[PDB]
Amino acid sequence: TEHDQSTDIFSADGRVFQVEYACKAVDNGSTAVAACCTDGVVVAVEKILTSRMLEEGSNDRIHAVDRQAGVCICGMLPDGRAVVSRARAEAENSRDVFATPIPGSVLASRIGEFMHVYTTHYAYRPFGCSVIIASYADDGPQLFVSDPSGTVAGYYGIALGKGKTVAKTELEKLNFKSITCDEAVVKLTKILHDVHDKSKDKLYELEVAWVCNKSNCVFQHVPNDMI
């Protein structure tokens, strides 16, 4: 069992255990959900509070990375913040060098590449976060997830963290072709209130954001009255 001490070693079965362990940190974190409508994309996440004395906005998990795109972090927040910085730099590079807003599919593939490189070298460890990427540039609305292995995929709806098995069940009873961004906020918030476990985590709040036609394809937090 020396094979699980660094990310630069395969096990006999063809696995990389340090990356699996990093994934377990995401699976024990707070729940997130997201949905891709015909207008846009909506993201929502549960924040577990550690004190009743925090200001509002503390330890935000959702961050803008360009005018038209945003990221939500699951698992370890300071690791997520390092990925947010990288993503900001790739979006700026696309505007400065190629004179375009970065397409959603390209942004997700660069984030994946960046995360993968920390699974290859004896001197670094894998990130302990999964990132939800939400974008609306010239390729339409797009929602992607990148995990600690650096694997990247596109979704119509998705859930992450410790409530994900149940939350997935409830996202399967939505109609993705038809739904608008105002309905979505009500349904997504409901799923998150229902999976919350009241024994373990006593204090919590919800954080919600979107990018859609209503907002002029600007990625932003929803106004706190719509919850």
């Binding site: 005018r67 004179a99 375009t100 807003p101 609306y136 010239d138 002029n216």
Partner: protein
Amino acid sequence: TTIMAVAFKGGVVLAADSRTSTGTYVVNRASNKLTKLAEKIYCCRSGSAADTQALAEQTANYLESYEIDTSKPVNVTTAANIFKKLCYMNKWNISAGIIVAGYDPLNGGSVYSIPSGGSCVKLDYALGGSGSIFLYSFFDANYKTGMSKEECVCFCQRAVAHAYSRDGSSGGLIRTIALHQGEPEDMTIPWTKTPYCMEKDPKYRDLAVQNPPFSSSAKITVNQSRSE
């Protein structure tokens, strides 16, 4: 400076702009660059104002004496020859491009060009000054022999307006004079009634899109006009 002369059936038209400048500042906005050498012979002057004023005055002095000694009006070829000789003998110490043009009953309307260096060439039209370079193509495409006196005045006004809309060293009034067997006819057009300028051409009304607003698309549309 933009100067020119064109022959027509039975005479010539001379035309010019009215600007004199030190490079980027306008010292006189109403100079007169059509200078009289005899009753029906004029020159157009480009280059150093001091040099062209001095050689025009000397040429005129010699023509007046010649006319008294023979008791007849002088021919255009005599004025061109006298002027050529002064330009050629002084070529290393002056900056001058001259056009001599006029009417006489032996040869009709004649145009001579005397560029830097002091050569002398007899032509159907001549161009001179910084602005001439903009007009070679305008004449190659739109000039014909045998125009009438009124056609030719209108054509030269238009030619001067095109050159001065593109050349920073030309501008102001357009002055013309027409020389034929009758009396000389001078005309001055003010800038406000110019027959062409870029400022009123409809293909240059809409501004280029250089300052597009910050957006979620790569489509280019309009310039930003108000703060966000």
